[PDB]
Curated annotation (Swiss-Prot), chain A:
There is a cross-link at residues 169, 192 (Glycyl lysine isopeptide (Lys-Gly) (interchain with G-Cter in SUMO2)). PROSITE patterns: RIBOSOMAL_S8E. The modification Phosphothreonine is found at residue 129. It comes from the Eukaryota. The keyword Transport does not apply. This is Small ribosomal subunit protein eS8. The gene is RPS8. The lineage of its organism: Eukaryota, Metazoa, Chordata, Craniata, Vertebrata.
Curated annotation (Swiss-Prot), chain B:
Component of the small ribosomal subunit. Part of the small subunit (SSU) processome, composed of more than 70 proteins and the RNA chaperone small nucleolar RNA (snoRNA) U3. Component of the 40S small ribosomal subunit. Plays an important role in controlling cell growth and proliferation through the selective translation of particular classes of mRNA. Part of the small subunit (SSU) processome, first precursor of the small eukaryotic ribosomal subunit. The gene is RPS6. Ribosomal protein S6 is the major substrate of protein kinases in eukaryote ribosomes. The phosphorylation is stimulated by growth factors, tumor promoting agents, and mitogens. It is dephosphorylated at growth arrest. The lineage of its organism: Eukaryota, Metazoa, Chordata, Craniata, Vertebrata. Residues 44-56 have a biased composition (Basic and acidic residues). It comes from Homo sapiens. The modification N6-acetyllysine is found at residue 38. It is found in: Cytoplasm; Nucleus, Nucleolus. Belongs to the eukaryotic ribosomal protein eS6 family. This is Small ribosomal subunit protein eS6.
UniProtKB/Swiss-Prot annotation, chain C:
This is Small ribosomal subunit protein eS4, X isoform. The modification N6-acetyllysine is found at residue 232. GO terms for cellular component: cytoplasmic ribonucleoprotein granule; cytosol; cytosolic ribosome; cytosolic small ribosomal subunit; extracellular exosome; focal adhesion; membrane; nucleolus. Component of the small ribosomal subunit. The ribosome is a large ribonucleoprotein complex responsible for the synthesis of proteins in the cell. Part of the small subunit (SSU) processome, first precursor of the small eukaryotic ribosomal subunit. During the assembly of the SSU processome in the nucleolus, many ribosome biogenesis factors, an RNA chaperone and ribosomal proteins associate with the nascent pre-rRNA and work in concert to generate RNA folding, modifications, rearrangements and cleavage as well as targeted degradation of pre-ribosomal RNA by the RNA exosome. The lineage of its organism: Eukaryota, Metazoa, Chordata, Craniata, Vertebrata. Residues 41-103 form the S4 RNA-binding domain.
From Swiss-Prot, chain D:
Citrullinated by PADI4. The modification Omega-N-methylarginine is found at residue 68. The modification N6-acetyllysine is found at residues 37, 44, 57. This is Small ribosomal subunit protein uS17. It is found in: Cytoplasm; Nucleus, Nucleolus. The modification N-acetylalanine is found at residue 1. It comes from Homo sapiens (Human). Its main location: cytoplasm.
Length: 205, 57, 262, 151
RNA sequence: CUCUCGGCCGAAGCGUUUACUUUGAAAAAA
RNA sequence: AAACUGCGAAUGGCUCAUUAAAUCAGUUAUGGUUCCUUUGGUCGCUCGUACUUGGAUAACUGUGGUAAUUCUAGAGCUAAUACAUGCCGACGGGCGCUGACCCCCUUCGCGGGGGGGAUGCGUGCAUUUAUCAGUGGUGACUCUAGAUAACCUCGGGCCGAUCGCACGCCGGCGGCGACGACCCAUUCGAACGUCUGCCCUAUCAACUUUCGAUGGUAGUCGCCGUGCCUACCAUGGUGACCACGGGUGACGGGGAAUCAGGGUUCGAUUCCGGAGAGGGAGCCUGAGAAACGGCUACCACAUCCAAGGAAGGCAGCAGGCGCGCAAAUU
């Protein structure tokens, strides 16, 4: 029953308007269906023109983009760590746009060790199971043994990312509006944005 | 009664017809896109020949 | 209202249709089509009012329903189909062919034309865009989209459409010295040579036109239709040659043309 | 840090600022490329728009607005908000009966970009129409000329 | 009213900004 | 005939109660959005039972209830362009990642460089995110196209299980139509904005701001732009150039009466635009309605009743009562 008209306000001078019609249908607004963390549940809406809006109520996965490596994989959303509008939305674990989430780094770890042949996020004791020994210590051909070592020089990672790879949980920021498209996509936090939101979460407590 | 969902010679002819309209729509996309591939060659070669009189002079 | 209007009052009709006051409350209300409803002549007005073939708005139904009427070479069974500028009306049962061109006074005209000319029409290019795996398109003023155009066709030029196939044959570009017809405004239906085109970026281009007698006029750019390359029209012209007579000499023509009688 | 005063991260959204570099990139220079664009009606983009560090999504040289419609002018009266000022336009209204005019005025709230820094009240400013930026703001400041009592 | 170009003739710039006046084009039909 | 399905019923008609920068008029904008239809485009562009799929349901037959309604319940059949599910064909491939292996050149050799390649993975056009480079455009795009990595909603996104008429050509190959159909364009619009403009009143001079008032940031919602709304901030915004409040025997214009010239007054009323269907409010369906010759409430009236219930909305055309100085035919 919400109405997002402009005529229920005061004028710029401060005078109140006497209205000249009743609430029209194109002025409507619908309730906020806040997207929580759970197994997927979307409910389609019928909007103007007969089109569809995917009003998501629970979401569990969403594909994110490691920007500096051109790697887009579908991860598992874990948590909400910080929301820069309201902080009661963090204790309610609501997924909105531009909220910082914890994702699962395991699809990116499998891409990194497949593309660069370097162990990422392993402990110092380095218990290396044989099923990934064949991708970390493979048998290379004559032209491939130089190609992998040619890739291996610039295969460095900023150390703020590797501490997240140690525990398996990356920081990500949602860039799509889940209550309107039904998806929770986004990107992985890298660099200056990462060390901004890190100290925001640290000073939050 | 009138049997519906019967494989009538008319019914089978209609499936032949709209398959024939798929071939004609693929016929033109092979032939319309070839002529513009020819027409872009003249309008690229003439621009290249105009280039050689303004960069040289 | 709530949703679109389906009626047209008579006094609210376009002035150039020349519907009288006392025949009804309503006017024919053109169907949606290629032309704006202010810029068109419905097929009921061309048959009943102009040509005097029909006598009522039921005989236009009885004529169009025998499929006797082709508008741009396709048979039209809507009596309120908006025919507009440069549209060819082929009636084959009688043998006539018309083209809708404006005359010097801002209306349309019954312009009978030869069936050797009725195989083509001109259109004006309105927007050119690429898309769909890099395939270029035109959009003309009839909403005709002609994909794969010539790369030297740009906006505001004139193509020549073959009406049996739909394809472009040859074009004219927007330049000075080209023969143009004005298709809107107070200089509507006037034919002259493009003199000058003044640019107003963020507003409308003004295109100064020069008559064949020396009468200069100007319009906005959107009321400009390039008809010929140079001074030779690629279509025929009406009985008057697109040259507007002032009312004094328009009177002199009548009071001297009655003196040929006896 | 001289930009990030907010609670979310101020970032120019078109520019990717986490490109991977090599040892001549980390030792050479920490270079943030900036997004600027040309307003098409003969307004020069200031050098502050090309060299600044401010972030503004409604700046007409660096943000997401396009200037279309009427281009107007007015003089500054009150600069007491965040990034927006109040200009007053002065005009004469012809009264037909008396064959005379009368002084009239209307105010406009108008967005001032941070590239136009050191603007004092009482100088003429060109404004340009865009989409609604807030409830009362629909024009954006385009060039600032100074009052004749300057030097 | 002048500077860099195209075929002496057009672009582009103006000059401090306007009011005034004249022309133009746009202004539903009745 | 009936009934299912489709489409319309959102237009037209009526009235003028609201409403004073509101409506509206001229002027611009959508580079900030949706658009049934019409017209043009597109519709083997995707490499992975079909010579035809599945279950119901009316009309109909038959048995009933209730004082009563365009009220309906149960039983037996049967269709689809209703509701569903779902291939083949084009189809041979091609393009990107991989990549055992093989081959070639040079080097004494190491080494360096260049081709072919089985294996697996992903491939269109719409959707959503991120990154790269710079065919066509504008006055200016964060535009249009291109490339790359992925996603693609079970309340699913397209890729046709459809009807007709003439009949055929060498078991295949067919010609004209009718319905559909995602997306693009157009048409018809709608919406939200820009600038300028309106009657009387100061016995209305300060107003707005808890409860959004003006602005900033992040989002929610919405067709989209925005305090539209929410969180955190900043303390602003309008006012003798008459804000704010009250009034109007105020719907606004095109126009009408009078008039030397200037003016004054009227404009409910047949054209354009707004609003509203007794008063407020909320919805369903649909391209479009906050719809009233649609529904659900409440307040006000009021019809039938077997007292348990049922149905309403003439500011449509007629007509009636009331009102009044004041207005026509069921």
């Amino acid at each position: 029953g919400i109405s997002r008209d402009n005529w229920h306000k005061r004028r710029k001078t401060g005078g109140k308007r006497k209205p000249y019609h009743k609430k029209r249908k194109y002025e409507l607004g619908r309730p906020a269906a806040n997207t929580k963390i759970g197994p997927r549940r979307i409910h389609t809406v019928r909007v103007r023109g007969g089109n569809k809006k995917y009003r998501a109520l629970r979401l569990d996965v969403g594909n994110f983009s490691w920007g500096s490596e051109c790697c887009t994989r579908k991860t598992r959303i874990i948590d909400v760590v910080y929301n820069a509008s309201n902080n009661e939305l963090v204790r309610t674990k609501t997924l909105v746009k531009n909220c910082i989430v914890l994702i699962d780094s395991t699809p990116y770890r499998q891409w990194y060790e497949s593309h660069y042949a370097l162990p990422l996020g392993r402990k110092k004791g380095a218990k290396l199971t044989p099923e990934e020994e064949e991708i970390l210590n493979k048998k290379r051909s004559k032209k491939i043994q130089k190609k992998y070592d040619e890739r291996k020089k610039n295969a460095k990672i900023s150390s703020l990312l590797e501490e997240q790879f140690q525990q398996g949980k990356l920081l990500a920021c949602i860039a799509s509006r889940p209550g309107q498209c039904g998806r929770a996509d986004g990107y992985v936090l890298e660099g200056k944005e990462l060390e901004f939101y890190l100290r925001k979460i640290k000073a939050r407590k | 009664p009138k049997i519906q969902r019967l494989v009538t010679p008319r019914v089978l002819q209609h499936k032949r017809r709209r398959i024939a309209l798929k071939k004609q729509r693929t016929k033109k996309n092979k032939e319309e896109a070839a002529e513009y591939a020819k027409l872009l060659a003249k309008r690229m070669k003439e621009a290249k020949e105009k280039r050689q009189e303004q960069i040289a002079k | 209202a709530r949703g679109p209007k389906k009626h047209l009052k008579r006094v609210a009709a376009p002035k150039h249709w020349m519907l009288d006051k006392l025949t009804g409350v309503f006017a024919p209300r053109p169907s949606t089509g290629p032309h704006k409803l202010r810029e068109c002549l419905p097929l009921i007005i061309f048959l009943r009012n102009r040509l005097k073939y029909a006598l009522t708005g039921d005989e236009v139904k009885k004529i169009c329903m025998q499929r006797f009427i082709k508008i741009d070479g396709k048979v039209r069974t809507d009596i309120t189909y908006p025919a507009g500028f440069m549209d060819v009306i082929s009636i084959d049962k009688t043998g006539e062919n018309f083209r809708l061109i404006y005359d010097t006074k801002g209306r349309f005209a019954v312009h009978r034309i030869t069936p050797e000319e009725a195989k083509y029409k001109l259109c004006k290019v309105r927007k050119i865009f690429v898309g769909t795996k890099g395939i270029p398109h035109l959009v003309t003023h009839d909403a005709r989209t002609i994909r794969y155009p010539d790369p030297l066709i740009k906006v505001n030029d004139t193509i020549q459409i073959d009406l049996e196939t739909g394809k472009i044959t040859d074009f004219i570009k927007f330049d000075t010295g080209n023969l143009c017809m004005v298709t809107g405004g107070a200089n509507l239906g006037r034919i002259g040579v493009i003199t000058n085109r003044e640019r107003h970026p963020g507003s409308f281009d003004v295109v100064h036109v020069k008559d064949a007698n020396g009468n200069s006029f100007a319009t906005r750019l959107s009321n400009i239709f390039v008809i010929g390359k140079g001074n030779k029209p690629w279509i025929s012209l009406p009985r008057g040659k697109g040259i507007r007579l002032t009312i004094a000499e328009e009177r002199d023509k009548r009071l001297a043309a009655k003196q040929s009688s006896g | 840090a001289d930009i990030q005063t907010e609670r979310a991260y101020q970032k120019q959204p078109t520019i990717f600022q986490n490109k991977k570099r090599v040892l001549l990139g980390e030792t050479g220079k920490e270079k943030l490329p900036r997004y600027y664009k040309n307003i098409g009606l003969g307004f020069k983009t200031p050098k502050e728009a090309i060299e600044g560090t401010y972030i503004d999504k409604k700046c007409p040289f660096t943000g997401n607005v396009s200037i279309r419609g009427r281009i107007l002018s007015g003089v500054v009266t009150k600069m007491k908000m965040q990034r927006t000022i109040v200009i007053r336009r002065d005009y004469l209204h012809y009264i037909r009966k008396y064959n005379r005019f009368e002084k009239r005025h209307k105010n406009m709230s108008v967005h001032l970009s941070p590239c136009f820094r050191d603007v004092q009240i009482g100088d003429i400013v060109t404004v340009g129409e865009c989409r609604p930026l807030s409830k009362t703001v629909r024009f954006n400041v385009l060039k600032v000329t100074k009052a004749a009592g300057t030097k």
